[model samples]
Target chain A: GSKTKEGVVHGVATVAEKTKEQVTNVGGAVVTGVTAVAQKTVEGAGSIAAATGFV
Target chain B: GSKTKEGVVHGVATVAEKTKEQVTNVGGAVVTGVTAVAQKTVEGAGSIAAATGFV
Candidate 1:
C-alpha cells in the first residue's frame, strides 16, 4: 500500500527546495527586471527624439 | 537648438515617472512570482506522485 512512500517524501522535499530556488530566482528577476524596464524607457526617449527630429 | 528642449524635458520627466512605475510593477511581480512558483512546484510534486504510482 505504501510502496512509493519513500519516493513521495523525496518528491515533497525536493519540491520544497525547488520552491526556495524559485523564490530566489524571482527576486533576481525583479532586480534585473526593473533595471531593464528603466533602461528601455530611457532608450524609448531616443525614439521620441528621432521621431520629432530632435536627433 | 532650443526648439525641442521643452519636449526633451517632458520626455525625460515622463520616462522618470515610467521608471517609477516599472519599479512598482517589478515589486508587484515579485510578490506574485514566488507564490506562482510555489504553486507550480507543488503541482510538479503531483506529477512525481503519479509517476511513482502514488496517485
Candidate 2:
C-alpha cells in the first residue's frame, strides 16, 4: 500500500489544467473588446473603413 | 497636426499590440505558477506518502 509520488503528480495535473483555462478565457475578452471599438471609430470611411477593410 | 486617422488607426492596432503583451504576460504567470505549484506539490506529497509508505 505505497502510493506517494503517483498521487501527488496526478493531483498537480488538475491544478494546472483549471488555472490554464482562465488565461485563455481572458484572451477572448481582449479580442472581443478590441474589435468592438472598430464599429464606433470606423464610421464607414472616417478612420479606417477601407484601409483595414475585411471580407 | 495632420494626423487624425493615424492616431485612431494606431488605437486599432497599437492598443492591439500592447494588450497582446499583457494577455501573454499573465498567460505565462498562470502557467508558471501552476507548473511550479505542480512541482512543489508533487514534492510535498512524496514527503507525506513516504512517511506513510516507510511505515
Candidate 3:
C-alpha cells in the first residue's frame, strides 16, 4: 500500500502537440491538468525522498 | 498549497491550416488529465507506470 510510510512522490509529464485547424475551428478550450504529488506525506524519509527533486 | 489530488484531463487540439470565412470559429477540445497514482506506487506500483509508458 504505502511505499515509504511517509508520503509518495508522483511524477507526471504532459506533452501537447497539435495544429491550427485542429485546435480552434474544430476544437474548443484548452485546459492543462494540474499535477499533484501522489503520496500523502505524514512523516519519515518519504518526505525527504520526495524532496530529492527540489534543492 | 498542497498537491497530489487527482484531476480530469482537459485540452483542445484546435488548430487550423488555411482560411475559411470572415472568421467562423476555431478551437480545440480534448482534455485529458492523468490518473492520480497517490504514491511512488500511489498505494501500489505496476499500475500507472505500466500505462504511462514506463518499464
Candidate 4:
C-alpha cells in the first residue's frame, strides 16, 4: 500500500522493539542485523531472477 | 526470482500481519513505524556502501 514493491518492508520489528530499550544490549545489533537480513534477501531474490534469465 | 533490483523484498510482514489487526490500539501507527524502519534500513546500507565506494 505504501511506497514499496511486492509489499516488502525490510522486517525490522526486533530492532524497533530493541530501540525502546535503554542503551547497550542488542539495540545496534538488532538494527544492523535487520539491515543485513534485508540486504541479503534483496540480493538473493535478484540472483534467483538473474539465474532464471528473467528480465 | 519474482522481480526486483537487488532482491530486497522490503520485509513488510508486520504490515502484512497488521492487516489482520484493526482500530482501537491503532494498528495504523504500527504499520507506519514498521515502514519507517524499512526505509531507514535501505538508507543505512546505501550510505555504508557509498561511503566505502562500493558503487
Report the number of the highest-DockQ candidate. Answer: 3
lDDT of 4 by residue, A1-55 (tens): 3343542435454323331322222111111112322233322222111111111
lDDT of 3: 0.31
What does candidate 2 score on TM? 0.15
Q: Where does model 3 exceed 4 Å of error?
A: A1-6, A10-13, A18-32, A39-55, B1-32, B36-55
What tens digits encode model 4's per-residue C-alpha lDDT throughout B1-55?
4445333444344322222322222111111122222222332322212101111
Which 10-residue window in model 2 chain B sums to the lowest lDDT? B46-55
Q: Provide the lDDT at A34 for model 4.
A: 22
Model 2 interface DockQ: 0.02
> What are the candidates' individual DockQ scores?
0.02, 0.02, 0.11, 0.08
TM-score of 4: 0.20
Quote each prediction's TM-score. Answer: 0.13, 0.15, 0.21, 0.20
lDDT of 1 at B51: 9
- Model 1: residues >4 Å from true position, as ranges? A1-23, A31-55, B6-55
Q: Can you rank all candidates by lDDT, best first? A: 3, 4, 2, 1
Poorly placed runs, candidate 2 (over 4 Å): A10-55, B1-20, B24-33, B38-55
Give the total clashing residue pairs for model 4.
9
lDDT of 1 by residue, A1-55 (tens): 3221111111111122121122233222232211101111221221111101111
- Return the candidate ranking by TM-score, descending: 3, 4, 2, 1
lDDT of 1: 0.17
Interface RMSD of each: 27.1, 27.8, 15.8, 15.4
- lDDT-better candidate, 3 vs 4: 3
- RMSD after CA superposition, every candidate: 27.1, 27.8, 15.8, 15.4
